[PDB]
Coordinates of all heavy atoms in Angstrom, one line a residue:
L131 N 0.9 -1.2 0.0 CA 0.0 0.0 0.0 C 0.9 1.3 0.0 O 0.6 2.2 -0.8 CB -0.9 0.0 1.2 CG -1.9 1.0 1.3 CD1 -3.0 0.9 0.2 CD2 -2.6 0.9 2.7
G132 N 2.0 1.2 0.8 CA 2.8 2.4 1.0 C 2.1 3.6 1.7 O 1.1 3.4 2.4
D133 N 2.6 4.8 1.6 CA 2.2 5.9 2.4 C 1.0 6.6 1.7 O 1.1 7.8 1.3 CB 3.4 6.8 2.6 CG 4.5 6.1 3.4 OD1 4.2 5.7 4.6 OD2 5.6 6.0 2.9
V134 N -0.1 5.9 1.6 CA -1.3 6.5 1.0 C -1.9 7.5 1.9 O -1.9 7.5 3.1 CB -2.4 5.4 0.6 CG1 -1.8 4.4 -0.4 CG2 -2.9 4.7 1.8
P135 N -2.6 8.6 1.3 CA -3.2 9.6 2.0 C -4.6 9.2 2.5 O -5.1 8.2 2.1 CB -3.2 10.7 1.0 CG -3.4 10.0 -0.3 CD -2.6 8.8 -0.2
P136 N -5.1 10.0 3.5 CA -6.4 9.6 4.1 C -7.5 9.4 3.0 O -7.6 10.2 2.0 CB -6.8 10.9 4.9 CG -5.4 11.4 5.3 CD -4.5 11.2 4.0
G137 N -8.2 8.4 3.1 CA -9.3 8.1 2.2 C -8.9 7.1 1.1 O -9.8 6.6 0.4
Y138 N -7.6 6.7 1.0 CA -7.0 5.9 -0.1 C -6.5 4.6 0.4 O -5.7 4.0 -0.2 CB -5.9 6.7 -0.8 CG -6.4 7.8 -1.7 CD1 -6.8 9.0 -1.1 CD2 -6.6 7.7 -3.0 CE1 -7.4 10.0 -1.9 CE2 -7.1 8.7 -3.8 CZ -7.5 9.9 -3.3 OH -8.0 10.8 -4.1
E139 N -7.0 4.1 1.6 CA -6.6 2.8 2.2 C -7.1 1.6 1.5 O -6.6 0.5 1.8 CB -7.1 2.8 3.7 CG -6.6 4.0 4.5 CD -7.6 5.2 4.4 OE1 -8.6 5.2 3.6 OE2 -7.2 6.3 5.0
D140 N -8.2 1.7 0.7 CA -8.9 0.5 0.2 C -8.1 -0.1 -1.0 O -8.1 0.7 -2.0 CB -10.3 0.8 -0.2 CG -11.2 -0.4 -0.6 OD1 -10.6 -1.6 -0.6 OD2 -12.4 -0.2 -0.8
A141 N -7.5 -1.2 -0.9 CA -6.8 -1.8 -2.0 C -7.7 -2.6 -3.0 O -7.2 -3.2 -4.0 CB -5.7 -2.7 -1.5
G142 N -9.0 -2.7 -2.7 CA -9.9 -3.4 -3.5 C -9.5 -4.8 -3.8 O -9.0 -5.5 -2.8
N143 N -9.5 -5.3 -5.0 CA -9.1 -6.7 -5.4 C -7.7 -6.6 -6.0 O -7.4 -7.5 -6.9 CB -10.2 -7.3 -6.3 CG -11.3 -7.8 -5.4 OD1 -11.1 -8.4 -4.4 ND2 -12.5 -7.4 -5.8
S144 N -6.9 -5.6 -5.7 CA -5.6 -5.4 -6.3 C -4.6 -6.5 -6.0 O -3.5 -6.5 -6.6 CB -5.0 -4.0 -6.1 OG -4.7 -3.9 -4.7
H145 N -4.8 -7.4 -5.1 CA -3.9 -8.6 -4.8 C -3.9 -9.5 -6.1 O -3.0 -10.4 -6.1 CB -4.3 -9.3 -3.5 CG -5.6 -10.0 -3.7 ND1 -6.8 -9.4 -3.7 CD2 -5.8 -11.3 -3.7 CE1 -7.8 -10.3 -3.8 NE2 -7.2 -11.5 -3.8
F146 N -4.7 -9.3 -7.0 CA -4.6 -10.0 -8.3 C -3.6 -9.4 -9.2 O -3.3 -10.1 -10.3 CB -6.0 -10.1 -9.0 CG -6.9 -11.2 -8.5 CD1 -7.9 -10.9 -7.5 CD2 -6.7 -12.5 -8.8 CE1 -8.7 -11.9 -7.0 CE2 -7.6 -13.5 -8.3 CZ -8.5 -13.2 -7.4
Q147 N -3.0 -8.2 -9.0 CA -2.0 -7.6 -9.8 C -0.7 -7.8 -9.2 O -0.5 -7.3 -8.0 CB -2.3 -6.1 -10.1 CG -3.5 -5.9 -11.0 CD -4.9 -6.2 -10.4 OE1 -5.3 -5.6 -9.5 NE2 -5.6 -7.1 -11.1
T148 N 0.2 -8.6 -9.8 CA 1.4 -9.1 -9.1 C 2.7 -9.0 -10.0 O 3.6 -9.9 -9.9 CB 1.2 -10.6 -8.6 OG1 1.0 -11.4 -9.7 CG2 0.0 -10.7 -7.6
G149 N 2.8 -8.0 -10.8 CA 3.9 -7.9 -11.7 C 5.3 -7.7 -11.0 O 5.3 -7.2 -9.8
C150 N 6.3 -8.2 -11.6 CA 7.7 -7.9 -11.1 C 8.7 -8.0 -12.2 O 8.5 -8.5 -13.3 CB 8.0 -8.9 -10.0 SG 8.3 -10.6 -10.5
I151 N 9.8 -7.3 -11.9 CA 11.0 -7.3 -12.8 C 11.9 -8.3 -12.1 O 12.4 -8.1 -11.0 CB 11.6 -6.0 -12.9 CG1 10.6 -5.0 -13.6 CG2 12.9 -6.1 -13.7 CD1 11.1 -3.5 -13.7
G152 N 12.2 -9.5 -12.8 CA 13.1 -10.5 -12.4 C 14.6 -10.2 -12.8 O 14.8 -9.4 -13.8
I153 N 15.5 -10.9 -12.3 CA 16.9 -10.9 -12.6 C 17.5 -12.3 -12.4 O 17.1 -13.0 -11.5 CB 17.7 -9.8 -11.9 CG1 19.1 -9.6 -12.5 CG2 17.7 -9.9 -10.4 CD1 19.9 -8.4 -11.9
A154 N 18.4 -12.7 -13.3 CA 19.2 -13.9 -13.2 C 20.7 -13.5 -13.4 O 20.9 -12.5 -13.9 CB 18.7 -14.9 -14.3
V155 N 21.5 -14.4 -12.9 CA 23.0 -14.2 -13.0 C 23.6 -15.4 -13.8 O 23.1 -16.5 -13.7 CB 23.6 -14.0 -11.7 CG1 23.4 -15.2 -10.8 CG2 25.1 -13.7 -11.8
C156 N 24.6 -15.1 -14.6 CA 25.3 -16.1 -15.3 C 26.5 -16.6 -14.5 O 27.2 -15.8 -14.0 CB 25.7 -15.6 -16.7 SG 26.3 -17.0 -17.7
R157 N 26.8 -17.9 -14.6 CA 28.0 -18.6 -14.0 C 29.2 -18.4 -14.9 O 30.3 -18.7 -14.5 CB 27.7 -20.0 -13.7 CG 26.5 -20.1 -12.8 CD 26.7 -21.3 -11.8 NE 28.0 -21.3 -11.1 CZ 28.5 -22.3 -10.5 NH1 27.8 -23.5 -10.5 NH2 29.6 -22.3 -9.9
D158 N 29.1 -17.9 -16.2 CA 30.2 -17.8 -17.1 C 30.1 -16.4 -17.9 O 29.1 -15.7 -17.7 CB 30.2 -19.0 -18.0 CG 28.8 -19.2 -18.8 OD1 28.7 -18.4 -19.8 OD2 28.0 -20.0 -18.4
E159 N 31.1 -16.1 -18.7 CA 31.1 -14.9 -19.7 C 30.3 -15.2 -20.9 O 30.1 -14.3 -21.7 CB 32.6 -14.6 -20.1 CG 33.4 -14.1 -19.0 CD 34.6 -13.2 -19.5 OE1 34.5 -12.5 -20.5 OE2 35.7 -13.3 -18.8
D160 N 29.9 -16.4 -21.1 CA 29.3 -16.8 -22.4 C 27.7 -16.8 -22.4 O 27.1 -17.0 -23.4 CB 29.8 -18.2 -22.9 CG 31.3 -18.0 -23.2 OD1 31.7 -17.0 -23.9 OD2 32.1 -18.9 -22.8
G161 N 27.2 -16.6 -21.2 CA 25.7 -16.5 -21.1 C 25.0 -17.9 -21.3 O 23.9 -18.0 -21.8
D162 N 25.7 -18.9 -20.8 CA 25.2 -20.3 -21.1 C 24.5 -20.9 -19.9 O 23.4 -21.5 -20.1 CB 26.4 -21.2 -21.5 CG 26.9 -20.8 -22.9 OD1 26.1 -20.2 -23.7 OD2 28.1 -21.0 -23.1
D163 N 25.0 -20.7 -18.6 CA 24.4 -21.4 -17.4 C 23.9 -20.3 -16.5 O 24.8 -19.5 -16.0 CB 25.5 -22.2 -16.7 CG 25.0 -22.8 -15.4 OD1 23.9 -23.0 -15.2 OD2 26.0 -23.0 -14.5
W164 N 22.6 -20.2 -16.2 CA 22.0 -19.0 -15.4 C 21.4 -19.5 -14.1 O 20.9 -20.7 -14.0 CB 20.9 -18.4 -16.3 CG 21.4 -17.8 -17.5 CD1 21.7 -18.3 -18.7 CD2 21.9 -16.4 -17.6 NE1 22.3 -17.4 -19.6 CE2 22.4 -16.2 -19.0 CE3 21.9 -15.3 -16.8 CZ2 22.9 -15.0 -19.4 CZ3 22.4 -14.1 -17.3 CH2 22.9 -13.9 -18.5
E165 N 21.5 -18.6 -13.1 CA 20.8 -18.9 -11.8 C 19.8 -17.8 -11.6 O 20.1 -16.6 -11.8 CB 21.9 -18.8 -10.7 CG 22.8 -20.0 -10.8 CD 22.3 -21.3 -10.1 OE1 21.4 -21.2 -9.2 OE2 22.8 -22.4 -10.4
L166 N 18.6 -18.1 -11.3 CA 17.5 -17.2 -10.9 C 17.8 -16.5 -9.6 O 18.3 -17.2 -8.6 CB 16.1 -17.8 -10.9 CG 15.5 -18.3 -12.2 CD1 14.3 -19.1 -12.0 CD2 15.2 -17.1 -13.1
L167 N 17.6 -15.2 -9.5 CA 17.7 -14.4 -8.3 C 16.3 -13.9 -8.0 O 15.4 -13.9 -8.8 CB 18.6 -13.2 -8.5 CG 20.0 -13.6 -9.0 CD1 20.8 -12.3 -9.3 CD2 20.8 -14.5 -8.0

């Protein structure tokens, strides 16, 4: 929710919106073997 102002506390059904920016790291310089972070 964060620091919402008075009157803006209702998140409705927004727990259905769950986007994220992921990142993985490579074990080599060649981009062959990846680990999810």
